[PDB]
Write a protein that binds this DNA or RNA. Structure first.
Length: 136
DNA sequence: CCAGCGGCAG
DNA sequence: TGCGCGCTGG
């Protein structure tokens, strides 16, 4: 279980559900966290699981993502990612549609106990990881 | 009521 | 290469 930290990372609240944590990383991509977080709550209220998100009509998701931008791109990504999350045989989420380095590094630091094996590039994640190494 | 900025899949 | 908004700054 990740310890108490001076950091403001949405991953620290979402880590028990890998899917929600990964969805947050999709919301945060090329988007202001100020915008992305309140919209992520609206999304999670309507789609609280991959089970329902994979059955969603991406155009419904898109309408919700409108003020964040990349709404069609991210809506189609979310639906497809959610389907792969439950149906593909994955060990690391980098194998899944729409997930890259950011989501993968977040998963290995927060959902699994592999923070030592990770080289984060995201500014906050990198400082958080520096704090783990310092306080190990 | 300006306008630059910020990696995934195809 | 397309994707996109509003925040940010002044």
């Amino acid at each position: 279980t990740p310890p108490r930290s001076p950091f403001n990372l949405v991953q620290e609240t979402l880590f028990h559900d890998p899917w929600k944590l990964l969805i947050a990383t999709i919301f945060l991509n090329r988007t202001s966290g100020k915008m992305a977080i309140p919209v992520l709550w609206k999304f999670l209220e309507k789609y609280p699981s991959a089970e329902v998100a994979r059955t969603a009509d991406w155009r419904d998701v898109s309408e919700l993502l409108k003020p964040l931008g990349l709404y069609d791109l991210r809506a189609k990504t979310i639906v497809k990612f959610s389907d792969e999350y439950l149906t593909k045989q994955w060990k690391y989420p980098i194998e899944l549609h729409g997930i890259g380095k950011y989501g993968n590094d977040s998963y290995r630091i927060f959902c699994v106990n592999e923070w030592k094996q990770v080289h984060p590039e995201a500014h906050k994640l990198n400082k958080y990881h520096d704090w783990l190494w310092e306080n190990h």
